[PDB]
Write a protein that binds this ligand. Structure first.
Ligand SMILES: *[C@@H]1O[C@H](CO)[C@@H](O[C@@H]2O[C@H](CO)[C@@H](O[C@@H]3O[C@H](CO[C@H]4O[C@H](CO)[C@@H](O)[C@H](O[C@H]5O[C@H](CO)[C@@H](O)[C@H](O)[C@@H]5O[C@H]5O[C@H](CO)[C@@H](O)[C@H](O)[C@@H]5O)[C@@H]4O)[C@@H](O)[C@H](O[C@H]4O[C@H](CO)[C@@H](O)[C@H](O)[C@@H]4O[C@H]4O[C@H](CO)[C@@H](O)[C@H](O)[C@@H]4O)[C@@H]3O)[C@H](O)[C@H]2NC(C)=O)[C@H](O)[C@H]1NC(C)=O
Ligand SMILES: Cc1cc(OCc2ccc[nH]c2=O)c(C(C)(C)C)cc1C#N
Ligand SMILES: [Ca+2]
Ligand SMILES: [Ca+2]
Ligand SMILES: [Cl-]
Ligand code: NA
Ligand code: NA
Ligand SMILES: [Zn+2]
Length: 802
């Protein structure tokens, strides 16, 4: 760096100048490449940040940090309280809220600017608990659009979440999978301290600033060096906003290190946390008074958003891997509020992940972490498809840390930390949107931060890069600039087979004790097989298959299915269970009954002999025989086309769900519609596998083994109306259960299923959208609700947090 060039006239330049030209962009400090006069010219502090009565009308002194001279407004460099002190104006916070129906912008503005005001570690409950000391933030919240909280991504660390905000992508896809990382392809490490993190190969997808630039929209900096004070960041944004039309950015970011920085020292609610919340509110006040001076307070859209929350965590709540593993020196641990383990040396072929996992599994009765192979982590975390995520993972209980050995912790510092499971209440953060494009005095339900990129694009008239948001699911936040998506087109149409095969054409090794015999009821069963009860069991239309495949719709009295000729089982099975439905047992005459389905060829059917031969694998049913409507309808549940491969350990889970939980939910929700099916995700990318990706078959057969089983349980949001006769909005909960040959995940699994199955299911709660990705199906195609509302419904996650 030739650092005796000047920053005069160039302070906080938007464009980067290449070596040996010295730099005056912020970031110069982060590279140690600023020109000599950077601090003198760009970080002025003289006289501080506020006008006082004596400064009003002063002669401009270019040394001052900000100005109270007559020419300051035109120049765009007044202290933010100038009109208040010197012209009798009110602070923005003291003005009444008035609806912003249209942007009220200076001539020459082509679109309302967007300012993203991001706050590190701002936990959701600060909005209520700190309300008395945050009056500017409370005005934004109550006058704008707000959610009770926003869900971060896992891990609930800073860079993964800020870069998710910027890209709309899960960490596995954007590549910033932690605050610390090793990439084995690069053979390089990423760390908070130091400068390898500024190398661009870490940062995937397309962040908002690049999306904007590529489409002709200019952007302010998103990264502020820690040594630039907050007052200067605000004044710099306000100066940029005063630029001529051809130079002025349309998108800006502010970032505060608080309240996270203090939260780590004092805990989320330590008495020392009041002051950092006050100071953040003051900074919001400075921005809003500043905008108001420039006549931009009813022109700019402001987003107030956090990256993650903060939980109580101390030194003594640390689990040590040295208390579980004798081999502790042969591993590397990425430690703290999550654990990631790999071999210390890849030339040590002694190292075995399976034995590590087993040494870490259910060893102490209140063990405060749980080991997983990354592919077995709850699918809702989307935390697996990246080479920077180690195969072995530890999910740490809230309030705890994991470390390799005690010397790492003592060689206590801190009372707060974050990083845990993104459904944990303490990790939830905030969202407020204020401006012409957001709604007025509107509360919206909680949503995930992956959704915001799309909205920021909508706010700026940009087409978003491909991302993991569901574009349109946040249309309810917006007064205008909504995105009006169309339902995806069905790719494969189904076959509707009638009766085509005689019983004796099947040689499947299956038996059913079913030989006993009317004319009223003969027409009656024909009609059920033609789909006469289908409006009862298929409430929201049939799911659309969004890929090329061969499948059949099969109708029955109690359930309807889309049966895949390729995978030899249903892609989906749909049924409604009323509040009044009863549970019956599987009779003795049918215990091992499997019956040929005369609508589907032997060639496209499973067979019982494969299951007899496969000593590890059994079978279950997608529509549960326990909930058949009548003894005669129960025969349908034993069709070979309703059978699916299940490990005996998984059958314990599944049978409990089907026999007990479904009926419980129907009683609690006033009927439920259930859609169940298999998922195949052998490469753990979160997306439906093709046939050539399947790694396990039922021994000796072409019957593929699912990695997971899903269910989507829908009812009326107004639970006074039965599921099958609902006029208004829907209510959903779903899960994606791992199809595992043991129950090692559940430490209490030797006990009765009433003590552990439900806890397992809650852990593996899912969005309907997660299931769509995993199956290539599109659900809720035929409702009376608006498509945007259905999109919101498909992104809902039932979290089971109290
Ligand atoms: C969340 O949203 C995102 C974004 O929509 C979804 O991720 C996308 O998934 C797509 C479907 O899998 C995927 O498409 C592939 O792209 C390959 C080209 O990719 C490069 O270019 C794009 C576009 O600019 C870029 O986005 C990519 O960026 C990734 O990689 C860089 C460099 O490593 C990273 O810095 C960055 O973080 C990002 O990493 C992530 O994605 C990759 C996979 O692409 C993962 O491996 C990482 O772990 C991380 O998750 C790239 O720079 C393209 O090569 C693929 O095409 C193959 O497949 C078919 C087969 O028929 C064929 O048409 C092609 O010819 C090709 O096949 C041949 O190559 C095969 C693979 O080597 C080979 O095995 C075969 O034998 C064949 O010869 C494919 O189209 C898209 O790139 C990503 N995008 C991103 C940003 O991740 C994600 O799925 C969503 N999640 C959920 C749950 O919904
Ligand atoms: C609002 C925002 C801020 C932001 O960084 C703020 C930042 C972090 C650490 C030190 N200093 C800072 O200024 C980023 C990254 C990707 C550049 C980290 C993205 C967004 C978005 N969207
Ligand atoms: Ca943070
Ligand atoms: Ca897959
Ligand atoms: Cl990390
Ligand atoms: Na078997
Ligand atoms: Na167990
Ligand atoms: Zn932190």
């Amino acid at each position: 760096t030739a650092t005796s060039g000047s920053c005069k006239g160039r302070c906080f330049e938007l464009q980067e100048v290449g070596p040996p030209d010295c730099r005056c962009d912020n970031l110069c400090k982060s590279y140690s490449s600023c020109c000599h006069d950077f601090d003198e010219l760009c970080l002025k502090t003289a006289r501080g940040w506020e006008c006082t009565k004596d400064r009003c009308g002063e002669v401009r002194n270019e040394e001052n940090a900000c100005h109270c001279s007559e020419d300051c407004l035109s120049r765009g460099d007044c202290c933010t309280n100038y009109q208040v002190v010197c012209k009798g104006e009110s602070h923005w916070v003291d003005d009444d809220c008035e609806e912003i129906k249209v942007p009220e912008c200076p001539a020459g503005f082509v679109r309302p600017p967007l300012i993203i005001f991001s706050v590190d570690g701002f936990r959701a409950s600060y909005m209520k608990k700190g309300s008395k000391v945050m009056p500017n933030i409370e005005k934004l919240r109550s006058c704008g659009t707000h959610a009770p909280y926003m869900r971060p991504v896992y891990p609930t660390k800073t860079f993964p979440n800020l870069y998710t905000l910027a890209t709309g992508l899960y960490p596995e896809s954007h590549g910033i999978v932690g605050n610390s990382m090793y990439d084995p392809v690069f053979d390089a490490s990423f760390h908070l301290r130091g400068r390898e993190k500024f190398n661009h190969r870490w940062w995937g997808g397309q962040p908002l600033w690049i999306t904007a630039t590529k489409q002709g929209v200019r952007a302010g900096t998103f990264f502020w060096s820690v040594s630039i004070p907050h007052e200067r960041r605000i004044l710099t944004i306000l100066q940029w906003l005063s630029l001529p039309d051809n130079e002025r950015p349309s998108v800006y970011a502010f970032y505060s290190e608080q309240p996270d920085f203090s939260g780590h020292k004092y805990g989320p609610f330590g008495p020392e946390m009041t002051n950092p919340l006050r100071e953040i509110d003051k900074t919001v006040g400075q921005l809003m008074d500043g905008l108001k001076q420039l006549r931009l307070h009813r022109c700019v859209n402001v987003i107030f958003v956090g990256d993650h929350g903060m939980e109580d965590v101390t030194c003594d709540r640390t689990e040590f891997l040295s208390n579980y593993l004798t081999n502790v020196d042969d591993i590397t641990l990425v430690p703290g509020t999550l654990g990631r383990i790999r071999a210390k040396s890849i030339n040590n072929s002694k190292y075995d992940p399976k034995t590590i996992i087993a040494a870490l599994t259910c060893k102490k009765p209140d063990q405060h972490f749980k080991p997983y192979m990354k592919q077995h982590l709850p699918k809702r975390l989307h935390y697996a498809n990246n080479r920077r995520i180690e195969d072995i993972h530890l999910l740490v209980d809230r309030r705890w840390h994991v470390a390799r050995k005690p010397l790492d912790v003592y060689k206590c510092f801190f009372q707060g930390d974050h990083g845990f499971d993104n459904k944990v209440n303490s990790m939830q953060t905030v969202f407020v949107g204020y401006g012409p494009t957001f709604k007025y005095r509107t509360k919206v339900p909680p949503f995930e931060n992956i959704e915001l990129y799309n909205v920021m694009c909508d706010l700026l008239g940009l087409k978003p890069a491909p991302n993991n948001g569901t574009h349109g699911s946040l249309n309810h936040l917006l007064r205008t600039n909504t995105f009006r998506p169309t339902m995806p087109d069905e790719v494969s149409r189904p076959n509707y087979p009638g009766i085509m095969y005689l019983q004796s054409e099947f040689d499947l090794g299956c038996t059913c004790d079913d030989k006993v015999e009317n004319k009223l009821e003969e027409l009656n069963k024909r009609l059920h097989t033609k789909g006469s009860t289908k409006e009862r069991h298929l409430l929201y239309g049939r799911p659309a298959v969004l890929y090329r495949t061969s499948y059949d719709i099969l109708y029955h009295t109690d359930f309807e299915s889309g049966y895949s000729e390729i995978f030899l089982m249903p892609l989906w099975t749909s049924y409604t269970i009323s509040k009044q439905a009863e549970v019956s047992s599987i009779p003795e005459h049918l215990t091992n009954c499997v019956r040929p389905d005369v609508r589907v060829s032997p060639g496209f059917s499973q067979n019982c002999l494969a299951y007899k031969n496969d000593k590890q694998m059994s079978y279950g049913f997608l529509f549960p025989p326990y909930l058949s409507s009548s003894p005669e309808a129960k025969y349908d549940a034993f069709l070979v086309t309703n059978m699916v491969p299940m490990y005996p350990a998984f059958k314990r889970v599944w049978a409990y769900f089907q026999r007990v939980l479904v009926k419980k939910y129907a009683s609690e929700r006033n009927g439920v519609n259930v859609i169940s099916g298999p998922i195949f995700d052998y490469n753990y990318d979160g997306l439906r596998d093709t046939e050539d990706e399947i790694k396990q078959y039922v021994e000796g057969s072409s019957i593929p083994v699912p990695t997971h089983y899903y269910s989507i349980i829908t009812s009326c949001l107004d639970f006074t109306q039965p599921a099958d006769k609902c006029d208004g909005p829907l209510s959903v909960s779903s899960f994606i259960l791992p199809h595992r040959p043991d129950n090692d995940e559940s430490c209490n699994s030797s006990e009765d299923e009433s003590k552990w199955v439900e806890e397992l299911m809650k852990m593996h709660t899912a969005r309907v959208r997660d299931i769509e990705h995993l199956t290539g199906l599109d659900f809720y195609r035929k409702t009376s609700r608006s498509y945007s509302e259905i999109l919101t419904l498909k992104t809902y996650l039932h979290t089971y947090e109290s």
